[PDB]
Ligand binder design. Structure first.
Ligand SMILES: C#CCNC(=O)CSc1nc2c(N)ncnc2n1[C@@H]1O[C@H](CN=[N+]=N)[C@@H](O)[C@H]1O
Length: 337
């Protein structure tokens, strides 16, 4: 068996190269059936029930989705029996880079920003049409190939939307990446509505315009104060939508902050881009633009075509890992001989 930097994927996959790490490690490899290099991630989740959760979610959702702007699973490798199954290998198309790596060193043209945003929202339209929330959209979860085709990846924190149960108290702990969290997560939201993903896309759009995160909070409440430092103080109407007193009185305790105009923050940006940015980065999640409205926005008019923006055929844990291991074993059976 080949070893990189204990990789067990043969004999279909050979000539492995390290790519990176972070629930395991990712390599590229030659696929001797399809005669092309692919990406393989090795996952070792079965001890920690948390790992088994994220792994099962990603596998289940990505095997059910089929969309040009969502990464597919080509193959899954694992032992023939549960007893012998310690690692799972996920095989995907090899993608040249991701948007995080790209924004570290490349300035994007406006034409690239517009194309990337279109593809992000086209993929998100399909996700949301399945009643799924991605819940961790950020640059490193947007893969890009050599021709800038964009595919959303990593559904390990994804959930079925549940708006009726979205309310919670002030300073409720949250897992998804801090810089891309909508302001209501810190105030009164569990992140169970589609508007959580639109906020994240707004943050991605801002970052494409300047190559720097727009709201780089250094800790939990600091995130909210970066957001308010640009958006300014919420209106009386938007406060009145927050019924929870601890959250509301926190906001009322802050000094008045004026809005920072988007065209002062991004003086080179296309004005239509900044109009759509404003609508994605709206404080009140009920007033925030939805995915299909964003696709119809004038910034995207070169690409918008609802007939070519498909939706899903149908919509979409306390569990002891023994049942989760078993669930993972079952979900991955279709790739065995
Ligand atoms: C197989 C499988 C499961 N795929 C994932 O879980 C998403 S990661 C990823 N998928 C890639 C892909 N299909 N082609 C090229 N490169 C990829 N990376 C890169 O692997 C290091 C980050 N790892 N992390 N998290 C960085 O270089 C990422 O660009």
């Amino acid at each position: 068996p080949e070893m990189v930097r204990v990789f067990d994927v043969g004999p279909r996959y050979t000539n492995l190269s390290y790519i990176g790490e972070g629930y395991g490690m990712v390599c590229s490899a030659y696929d001797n059936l399809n005669k092309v290099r692919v990406a393989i991630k090795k996952i070792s989740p079965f001890e920690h029930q948390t790992y088994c959760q994220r792994t099962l979610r990603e596998i289940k959702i990505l095997l059910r989705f089929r969309h040009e702007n969502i990464i597919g699973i080509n193959d899954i490798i694992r032992a023939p029996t549960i007893e012998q199954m310690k690692d799972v290998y996920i095989v995907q198309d090899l993608m040249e880079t991701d948007l995080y790596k790209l924004l570290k060193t490349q300035h994007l043209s406006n034409d690239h920003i517009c194309y990337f945003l279109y593809q992000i929202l086209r993929g998100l339209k399909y996700i949301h049409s399945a009643n799924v929330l991605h819940r961790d959209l950020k640059p490193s979860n947007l893969l890009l190939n050599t021709t800038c085709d964009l595919k959303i990846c990593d559904f390990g924190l994804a959930r079925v939307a549940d708006p009726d149960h979205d309310h919670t108290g002030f300073l409720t702990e949250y897992v998804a990446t801090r810089w891309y969290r909508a302001p209501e997560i810190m105030l009164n939201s569990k992140g169970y509505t589609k508007s959580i993903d639109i906020w994240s896309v707004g943050c991605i759009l801002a970052e494409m315009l300047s190559n720097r995160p727009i709201f780089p909070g250094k800790h939990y409440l600091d995130q909210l104060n970066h957001i308010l430092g640009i958006l300014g103080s919420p209106s009386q109407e938007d406060l009145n939508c927050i019924i929870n007193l601890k959250a509301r009185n926190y906001l009322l305790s802050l000094p008045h902050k004026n809005k920072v105009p988007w065209n002062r923050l991004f003086p080179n940006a296309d004005s239509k881009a900044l109009d759509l940015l404003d609508k994605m980065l709206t404080f009140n999640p009920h007033k925030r633009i939805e995915v299909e409205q964003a696709l119809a926005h004038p910034y995207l008019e070169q690409y918008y075509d609802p007939s070519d923006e498909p939706i899903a055929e149908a919509p979409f844990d306390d569990l002891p890992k023994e049942k989760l291991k078993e669930l993972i074993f079952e979900e991955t059976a279709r790739f065995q001989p």
